Amino acid sequence: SYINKPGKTSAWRVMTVRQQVSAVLAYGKIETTLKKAKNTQKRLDKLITLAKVDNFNNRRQVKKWLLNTNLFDVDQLMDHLFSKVAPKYEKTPGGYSRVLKLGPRRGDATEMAILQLTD
Amino acid sequence: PIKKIISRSNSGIHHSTVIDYKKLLTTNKNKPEKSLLVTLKKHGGRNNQGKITVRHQGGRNKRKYRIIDFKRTHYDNIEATVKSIEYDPNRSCFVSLITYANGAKSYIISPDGIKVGDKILASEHPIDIKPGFSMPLAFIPEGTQVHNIELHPKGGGQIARSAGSYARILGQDETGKYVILQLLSGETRKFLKECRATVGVVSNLDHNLVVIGKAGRNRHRGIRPTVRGSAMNPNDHPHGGGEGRSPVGRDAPRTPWGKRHMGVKTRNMKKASTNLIIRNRKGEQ
Amino acid sequence: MKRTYQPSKLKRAKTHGFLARMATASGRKVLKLRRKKQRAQLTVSSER
Amino acid sequence: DVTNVLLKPVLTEKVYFNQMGETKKYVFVVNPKASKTRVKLAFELVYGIKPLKVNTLIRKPTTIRGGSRFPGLSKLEKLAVITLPKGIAISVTGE
RNA sequence: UGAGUAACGCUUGGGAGUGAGAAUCUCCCAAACCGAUUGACUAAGGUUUCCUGGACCAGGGUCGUCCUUCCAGGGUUAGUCUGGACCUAAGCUGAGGCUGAAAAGCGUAGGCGAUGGACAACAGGUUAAUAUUCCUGUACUUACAGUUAGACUGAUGGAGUGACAAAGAAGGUUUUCCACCCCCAUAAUUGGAUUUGGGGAUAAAUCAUAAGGUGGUACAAUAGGCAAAUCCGUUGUGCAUAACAUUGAGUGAUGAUGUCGAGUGAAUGAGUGAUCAAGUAGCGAAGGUGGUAUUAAUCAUGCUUUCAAGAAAAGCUUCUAGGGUUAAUCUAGCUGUAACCAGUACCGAGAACGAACACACGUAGUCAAGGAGAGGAUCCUAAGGUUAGCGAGUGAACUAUAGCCAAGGAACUCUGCAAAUUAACCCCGUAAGUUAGCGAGAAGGGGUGCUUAUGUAAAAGUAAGCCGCAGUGAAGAACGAGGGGGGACUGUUUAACUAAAACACAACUCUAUGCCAAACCGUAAGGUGAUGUAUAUGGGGUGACACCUGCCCAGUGCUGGAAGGU
RNA sequence: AUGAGCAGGUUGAAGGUUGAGUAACAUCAACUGGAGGACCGAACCGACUCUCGUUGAAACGAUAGCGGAUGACUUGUGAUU
Ligand SMILES: [Mg+2]
Ligand SMILES: [Mg+2]
Ligand SMILES: [Mg+2]
Ligand SMILES: [Mg+2]
Ligand SMILES: [Mg+2]
Ligand SMILES: [Mg+2]
Ligand SMILES: [Mg+2]
Ligand SMILES: [Mg+2]
Ligand SMILES: [Mg+2]
Ligand SMILES: [Mg+2]
Ligand SMILES: [Mg+2]
Ligand SMILES: [Mg+2]
Ligand SMILES: [Mg+2]
Ligand SMILES: [Mg+2]
Ligand SMILES: [Mg+2]
Ligand SMILES: [Mg+2]
Ligand SMILES: [Mg+2]
Ligand SMILES: [Mg+2]
Ligand SMILES: [Mg+2]
Ligand SMILES: [Mg+2]
Ligand SMILES: [Mg+2]
Ligand SMILES: [Mg+2]
Ligand SMILES: [Mg+2]
Ligand SMILES: [Mg+2]
Ligand SMILES: [Mg+2]
Ligand SMILES: [Mg+2]
Ligand SMILES: [Mg+2]
Ligand SMILES: [Mg+2]
Ligand SMILES: [Mg+2]
Ligand SMILES: [Mg+2]
Ligand SMILES: [Mg+2]
Ligand SMILES: [Mg+2]
Ligand SMILES: [Mg+2]
Ligand SMILES: [Mg+2]
Ligand SMILES: [Mg+2]
Ligand SMILES: [Mg+2]
Ligand SMILES: [Mg+2]
Ligand SMILES: [Mg+2]
Ligand SMILES: [Mg+2]
Ligand SMILES: [Mg+2]
Ligand SMILES: [Mg+2]
Ligand SMILES: [Mg+2]
Ligand SMILES: [Mg+2]
Ligand SMILES: [Mg+2]
Ligand SMILES: [Mg+2]
Ligand SMILES: [Mg+2]
Ligand SMILES: [Mg+2]
Ligand SMILES: [Mg+2]
Ligand SMILES: [Mg+2]
Ligand SMILES: [Mg+2]
Ligand SMILES: [Mg+2]
Ligand SMILES: [Mg+2]
Ligand SMILES: [Mg+2]
Ligand SMILES: [Mg+2]
Ligand SMILES: [Mg+2]
């Protein structure tokens, strides 16, 4: 069998995590598959804890992950993260995000999951 | 004369040779006279039924026929002047654009040895023994070269029209007609007294020594590949079949259509022209 | 690949058309037989 | 002359778009065998105002009610677009 | 039954909304591929598949509120575009006529037949769907009538032009491009910012000017051009660094107080709001200077060389014939009238065509962006376009595709099959043999990055310095040597198991053929050979080039032969 | 029969001009010229090899290599056996 689809490549996986983490930082909730939420959670927590010092080095580190969204750009997401979201989690020992399971999809029966910022 | 071609293309080696066309032709350019120019339709070796009739013919380049005055009888008693020796793609011999005194133009088969400005004149009296002059065969002294011989009286030139072709006069007959003509291939014929012919040898005497160097040149000339009979199937040719390279196998070689064809004579002896032949390249009659 | 049938509005009409069939005795006989079978599409002319 | 080459006027969005703004353009359906000159003569003999120019459309027949138990073809239409001069606008109904 | 098994035929995430129901529908933001193409214009074909609204019987390899599916309505505008009313090529038809048991075959005059020739329109705007067609602006062409002025008008016929091959290289002018300048928006909290990004346009037609290109110019005689000729052809004379005739890309002025234009950007109304409305209507600045040792287009149906010697007719010009003379016709101007028929939608193809399939196949031509690059190669993107019409998991055996593999390096195997090495540019160097052309990119080696300076029109290069394990740092680029067999070579061949030593090829030889030629298609007419003429044609065999080709005429075949026998 | 197509880059024949040379030829050197069934290599044409597929995506293809690529070339339309 040949002329197969490109597939879930490593580059595709990193881009998927980038898109979901940018969206979850912009809006605050993501309705995805459970196995994708359980992988985006790691990057979400890592970004939030590194964005707690608000130095230019940390901006350069975060910019390798953030992507443009509808509600914010790549530069206004920076202001939202470093001034609104991250300062809230200033003394929380990890676990800023929660993943909970919704029902199965009508056309796939895969287990959905909502990823949210735990206040 | 001939001139060699040095290809220096490193795909095989071919010592190709071509006619010079520089010291033999007046102008190297191709400027035929428009008036006497009709286009030729390539039959491709196919008859009116569309079926291949003469094999190995097809694929020549586009040509335009130049009207040639083989009869040379309309403008008799009128002096003509050669203006240019040109190349005719439909015949091996060069053609001369001659002009008559009244201003008419025509194309004739160019005799060898004539140059631009040589006067020509045809009629039915002695005239003069000059190259290109066309007179009836009765008044030509025996021994001179003659070409463009006319078979049927009042007709056009039919014999000795190719490049370097000529015929010799060998006296007369006691009948009062049928002047003797020794032609090429060592054949002796009896041509009628009133028959008209032109003296001189046809030009382009070195057309024998031209050497083709490539398949493409012969293909462009209008010759298709000829397949030998030994390579054929047992159908479509008598010399086919076999298991490996096989000999003729039969008692004699055969045509594709199955006749002996080898050494057998294929002339219809019950012809009115048989009595006018003295020798047939081998013996009497 | 180049398949056998390459459609052409002219070749079809000039080969199997009504005028082509009505030019020889064989074509007239074919048309007579098709009338006997009462074919709605007598020739390729009546495409629509 | 006989005036059987003016079958039916037609009113669509395109027709009403043209039928406003100084010069009016009236679209009728005509005999498919009729020519432009016959159309101008018919308008002369039945309306009275010389057309400025005439344009013609041929709409090919096509299959209709496809998949229905008995399918049927369309009817051949020739459309004519008459345009009267500036400032004149006659009514298609009412004579 | 196999069996709820194989398969579902190359493309992701999220937010909002509709809906009874959404991974699949709509919008938005990204993301990933195409970008000498999955982009845009059309020929052929397809024949309504095009636009709007509605529906989810059936079809869509899943789903579906959605579809190239179904229902209802609507959509294709020409004096100038593509073809007829114009002309012919191959070829077809073909009154008479020829040939033939019949049907029919051949064929003359005529008539058809484009893939060719001749012929008058460009720019912008507009609808959901059409636009050199509708609208605006500015033009052109052909007919008919009246009129004014001038002129003798001159074809169904003659002549000229139309009218032409392949390859190659120079010029002229516009360009591409470069530099400057003008105009618009921008001034940036992540360390420094004194900048960053974008645009700089106008056609057909009319008038004037045209770089040049092509070919000698007038006068006089004529017996030739199915009659005639003042035209053509031919022959003389004069002048011929030029004149005369014809043609000609470009330039300037009107066309243009117009149009387009980067950008700016509503109102009105829908809606709960945002948003739509729409980034729509409207507004809309600059709209230029110089160079070029870089580019492509045109002049160009121009020029040179070579042999394989390179369409016809219409049309245009001209000539008399023939018709006028108290006229007709033509030319130029003005006024008015008219310009017919068919096509015009959409697709033009990893979903509309040919392949039965929304099939990894095939299908003429035209436009061709930037960086590096010889390049339309290669990598990444621009204008633009798509979401490969089943998904989500897991990362067992096993399979396909890739990547890598320490030491050895063909020990593997029928065989180095396959894979691997080399690869671009520049600088050195290059043997045996040879038909002196080649071998040859032989073999074998070296350098490539960045900065400064010198070099140039630009370079290339040169000198010094710096960094890395590595510098055409990634993509795309030949592995080589030696001996032998066959075929000289370039080529052709068994569509779909054999591409080869087979076929062909240039060359050699034999044989037949004197023209109503031999040979060949048919039954014959007719035709090919050939509008050719022994330096030509047909057939058999061999297959560059070099050296050779020996003996046998008993049998067979072929040619000739006196008589004699049958 | 009538049209169209072959990105780009190399090699540098015949011939001609000039000079030396020859009693005059021959010959040699420089320049010009741009030929080749020439060379490398895209579109284009073809199909030599491995693997995959063999109830296929496909009643003959896919990926990776491969041969020709100005000519005995390729191809569109029309006619014909
Ligand atoms: Mg990658
Ligand atoms: Mg002619
Ligand atoms: Mg032959
Ligand atoms: Mg021959
Ligand atoms: Mg065989
Ligand atoms: Mg036999
Ligand atoms: Mg045999
Ligand atoms: Mg044997
Ligand atoms: Mg129309
Ligand atoms: Mg069963
Ligand atoms: Mg079952
Ligand atoms: Mg089982
Ligand atoms: Mg299983
Ligand atoms: Mg499965
Ligand atoms: Mg699929
Ligand atoms: Mg998918
Ligand atoms: Mg890309
Ligand atoms: Mg396309
Ligand atoms: Mg339909
Ligand atoms: Mg639609
Ligand atoms: Mg709908
Ligand atoms: Mg379904
Ligand atoms: Mg118009
Ligand atoms: Mg016609
Ligand atoms: Mg045409
Ligand atoms: Mg459209
Ligand atoms: Mg800063
Ligand atoms: Mg006369
Ligand atoms: Mg269209
Ligand atoms: Mg395709
Ligand atoms: Mg199809
Ligand atoms: Mg598909
Ligand atoms: Mg195409
Ligand atoms: Mg490019
Ligand atoms: Mg590419
Ligand atoms: Mg490695
Ligand atoms: Mg490694
Ligand atoms: Mg190893
Ligand atoms: Mg080793
Ligand atoms: Mg071994
Ligand atoms: Mg072993
Ligand atoms: Mg190999
Ligand atoms: Mg070697
Ligand atoms: Mg040996
Ligand atoms: Mg070979
Ligand atoms: Mg070969
Ligand atoms: Mg085969
Ligand atoms: Mg094969
Ligand atoms: Mg005969
Ligand atoms: Mg003939
Ligand atoms: Mg042989
Ligand atoms: Mg041999
Ligand atoms: Mg004997
Ligand atoms: Mg005998
Ligand atoms: Mg070649």
Author numbering:
A (entry chain m): 2 to 120
B (entry chain a): 2 to 286
C (entry chain 0): 1 to 48
D (entry chain s): 2 to 96
Cite, word for word, the article reporting this structure.
Chloramphenicol (Cm) is a well-studied ribosomal peptidyl transferase center (PTC) binder and growing evidence suggests that its inhibitory action depends on the sequence of the nascent peptide. Here, we use cryo-electron tomography to analyze the impact of Cm inside the bacterium Mycoplasma pneumoniae. By resolving the Cm-bound ribosomes to 3.0 Å, we elucidate Cm’s coordination with natural nascent peptides and transfer RNAs in the PTC. We find that Cm leads to the accumulation of a number of translation elongation states, indicating ongoing futile accommodation cycles, and to extensive ribosome collisions.
Subjecting 30,774 ribosome-containing subtomograms from 137 cells to structural analysis resulted in a 70S ribosome map at 3.0 Å global resolution, with an overall B factor of 85 Å2. The blurred local density indicated that the CCA tail is not stably positioned and may adopt different conformations. Connecting to the CCA tail of the P-site tRNA, the nascent peptide could be traced from the PTC to the peptide exit site, with side-chain densities resolved for amino acid residues from positions 0 to −3. Hence, amino acid residues at positions 0, −1 and −3 were built as Asp, Ala and Lys, in line with the sequence reported to be overrepresented in Cm-stalled ribosomes. The remaining nascent peptide after position −4 could be traced only for the backbone and was modeled as poly(Ala) (labeled as poly(UNK) in the model). From position −4 onward, the nascent peptide is kinked by nearly 90°, which places it far away from the PTC and the Cm-binding site. For instance, we modeled a number of naturally bound polyamine molecules, namely, cadaverine, putrescine, spermine and spermidine, as well as magnesium and potassium ions. Our structural models demonstrate the natural composition of polyamines associated with ribosomes inside M. pneumoniae cells.
